[model samples]
Target: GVNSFSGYLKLTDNVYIKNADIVEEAKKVKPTVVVNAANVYLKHGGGVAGALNKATNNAMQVESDDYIATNGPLKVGGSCVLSGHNLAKHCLHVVGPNVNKGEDIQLLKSAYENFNQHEVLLAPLLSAGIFGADPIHSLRVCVDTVRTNVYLAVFDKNLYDKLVSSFLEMKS
Candidate 1:
């Protein structure tokens, strides 16, 4: 009787999911920009031979192994360059290279070391539909130190604010 009497029931209600789920779905559907740890570390490393080696190796893994290129429009490589425009979505790789006598490199290395040692809370912001064609936004949050600086390559200020807010809200 239960099987035979099966009928469609309709209910008017809204479903709420975490922002992380939305971000994941967006990542699945379109291109995304992620300010990854390796890039951040490398950029701050300022071309230190060891750090650069690690950064490049990590980036290569991200590109080849992570399905980053296949997923969406943008994949930033931390080298401050944008690539893969002809594909469905454009990938913008931003690399803040070591500038001026490896000063930046030292700064980035310190940041990475400190982050590891202190276990500071790094936040990630997800801006859904913010970049129009691009669907997900990923960023790393850290405080300014003597050797490290945070840089964003965004053209829109509002988007930047959203990103900052998201980063501040990240859990660990």
Candidate 2:
């Protein structure tokens, strides 16, 4: 039996999914950049934002606020980057749309576009938290976006199991 739940989905030669914490998995994968599923304001209040901020001992929160003050609030599909501090080299903060927006599909893809294939990137399940985006839909957008050297971190056990099954059923 496995001590901790973990799984992988090789969507393509370059992209894959990892069932683990974004921050902890970054330690093993040592990604050049990691993505955060953040609010438009980049508040670092909860979800991936809170996790990374706390991991960096609140330095990320400070930087996030500073960026917002200068750049103003980000819109859906918009993103920003901050020093990864104790986590990775860079942290890309992606703002996704709420389910109520009806553009979760497109905007979610836009958020994923903030990163490229040149670097080892780790991304969380975007807009699937309190933001209320459907987990299945968000998972598909994440898989479709980043082409290479990208790891989709699925931290929740139930979601991980559900997504693993979903991926298995996918034709591609």
Candidate 3:
């Protein structure tokens, strides 16, 4: 009923009634992030269920990341990134335990490598503190690794120029 009504109105007026409903719902719940973990089954041979368990463990320490577990057999269509599918939202659906630890590490390493090759700065990567080998390392790891001029999005002119000068002199 809700889907049909929303779809019909959207088709006629090009307005999203579903989004209106979501806004109304959000006002009542006021959730920082909505977690949809319904349909999740923990029993053996339950494919998505097993994946949810693993994600829950890894996501436990991350306050910013929300884990939503659904039981339905991996149905297509969501904002989460799996394979080549890219969702618009900042969602990650991890369906297997074999998901690479090195892959995440490589992503960090590759950002540095890309900066070195492209000679252009990636602001978000630097701001997120991903320049170092690990999260605990000094912020300078980003400066050390990047070969291009480093300019932060923030308005700190002194810090920005310093970072730029540091990147100019950075070695491999």
For each candidate in turn, the TM-score is 0.21, 0.85, 0.24
Query: Can you give the lDDT of residue 137 in candidate 3?
Result: 23
For model 2, the superposed segments whose C-alpha errors exceed 4 Å read 1-7, 100-105
lDDT values for all models: 0.28, 0.76, 0.27
Query: Model 1 over residues 130-169: C-alpha lDDT tens digits?
Result: 2111211223312222122222223345655564465457
Candidate 3 residues 1-172, lDDT tens each?
A: 1111212111111111122222233223332222121121212122322233334443421322222343234322122221111111112232211112222333334333333432222122221221123321213444445554422232234544454454346452
The whole-model C-alpha lDDT of candidate 2 against the native structure comes to 0.76
What's every prediction's RMSD, in angstroms?
Answer: 17.7, 4.3, 16.5
Candidate 3 or 2, higher lDDT: 2
Clashing pairs in 3: 39-71, 40-71
Q: Write the per-residue lDDT of candidate 2 for residues 1-172, one digit (tens) a residue.
A: 1112135677676567767887787666556677888888888877778888888899988888899899999988888877888677788888888776565556778877776533567787788768887787877776777665667788888888888798779878
Model 1 earns a TM-score of: 0.21
